[PDB]
Amino acid sequence: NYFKSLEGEKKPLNEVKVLLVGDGEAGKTSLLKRLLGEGFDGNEHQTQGINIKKWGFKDKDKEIKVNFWDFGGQEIMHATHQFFLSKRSLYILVLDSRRDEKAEYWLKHIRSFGGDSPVLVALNKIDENPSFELNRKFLQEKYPSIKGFFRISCKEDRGIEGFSQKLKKELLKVEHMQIEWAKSWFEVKTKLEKMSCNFITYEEYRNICLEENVGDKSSQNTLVDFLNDLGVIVHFKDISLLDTHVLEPKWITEGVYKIINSEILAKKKGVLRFSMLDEILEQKKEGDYYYPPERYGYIINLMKKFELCYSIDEETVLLPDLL
């Protein structure tokens, strides 16, 4: 073994996170069903919360793997979807007529988080409003990330075939599709995927890496950046956030919603003292997620980061909506 255990054979990654974004009741969940060939029944508004569907297709030899992220009505309303928007990904912006010109709002939003990630704009519900159009030449020039506009109808199944062909084509052209990994990096990845924990500390991640061939920090830090962008974990490089490596996205959101929908916080005009978090994040019943006291800082600072929270002093924070 010692003689031939220095280098390693490198397979291609071929994975991308696809983020369905846009206003609530626009067509995101419906469009996702059409891409996977699940049809349309009219009752897809009943499906809410974080839904991650794993999809794949074979282009020639290459086995392409896709991770669709679908954000529910609570996610867009409370803006908790911001936690999962990442670079080196692909974005699908779903729009509709009823909300007049909200596209440029979303394009600036995707630009700030997505970076160089390509965007495909879907003009949904043309059966309800045929005349619905956008100034395409203006938008694609101002936002080079836009690769195409598509008038579609998830109800009548119009324009999905054309949209799906462009999606497949642009998915192959993403920058990190050509990038290739060592065998150990895939073993770390697949280990994390099969784990059922809510999160892991940065010590535990380094141990999992040690277990596998990669033991040097430089390589370990490059791997989490990928794993974050691929959607295997949810990780941030801020000093107050970097310890928590979230494996279950619902752990974060349900913790934030408990704070936002706290009846004790409703009174007091939304002033959140950190002594109150014990009662709010306590395990009541029926599979409530466990929130350790050491992760109180994570949740609060995470909410502060994306402007769901504003600091009054060092021990308290404000919720403007409850004021």
Ligand X SMILES: Nc1nc2c(ncn2[C@@H]2O[C@H](COP(=O)(O)OP(=O)(O)O)[C@@H](O)[C@H]2O)c(=O)[nH]1
Say whether residue 309 binds ligand X (CB under 6 A).
no
Of the CA atoms within 13 Å of residue 123, those in its CB half-sphere come to 18
Pairing, β 316-318 against β 199-200: unpaired
Cβ 38 to ligand X shortest distance, Å: 12
Q: Does 155 bind ligand X (CB under 6 A)?
A: yes
Binding mask 64-103 for Mg ion (x = CB under 5 A): --------x-------------------------------
User: Restricting to residues 18-47, which ones interact with ligand X according to CB under 6 A?
Assistant: 24-30, 42, 44-45
Report if residue 99 touches ligand X, rule: CB under 6 A: no
**Could you tell me whether strands 316-318 and 271-273 are parallel, antiparallel, or unpaired per DSSP bridges?**
antiparallel
Instruction: Please select the residue that binds Mg ion; options are 15, 16, 22, 29, rule is CB under 5 A.
Output: 29
Q: Which one of residues 59, 116, 127, 294 is an interface residue with ligand X (CB under 6 A)? A: 127
Q: Is 128 in the site for ligand X (CB under 6 A)?
A: yes
Residue among 73, 85, 152, 136 nearest 113 (CA): 85
The angle subtended at Cα 68 by Cα 66 and Cα 71, nearest 5°, is: 165
Point out which span in 54-62, 121-129, 243-251, 276-284 binds ligand X (CB under 6 A): 121-129
In sequence order, which residues have a C-beta less than 8 Å from that of residue 21 and are 6 or more positions away? 28, 71, 81, 85, 91, 92, 93, 94, 106, 109, 110
Return the SS3 of 30. helix
Q: Are the CB atoms for 302 and 284 separated by under 8 Å? A: no
- 90 with 63: CB under 8 angstroms? no
- Considering only 10-18, 82-90, 153-161, 214-222, which stretch makes contact with ligand X by CB under 6 A? 153-161
What sign for the dihedral angle of Cα 17, 18, 22, 24? negative
Contacted by 228, from Mg ion, ligand X, none: CB < 5 to 8 Å by type: none
Binding flag, residue 148, ligand X (CB under 6 A): no
- Closest to 62 measured CA to CA, from 147, 165, 148, 180: 180
Please state the residue numbers annotated as binding site for GDP. 25-30, 44, 124-125, 127, 154-155
> Which stretches of the chain bind Mg ion, using CB under 5 A?
29, 72
Please state the residue numbers annotated as binding site for Mg(2+). 29
> Which stretches of the chain bind ligand X, using CB under 6 A?
24-30, 42, 44-45, 73, 124-125, 127-128, 153-155
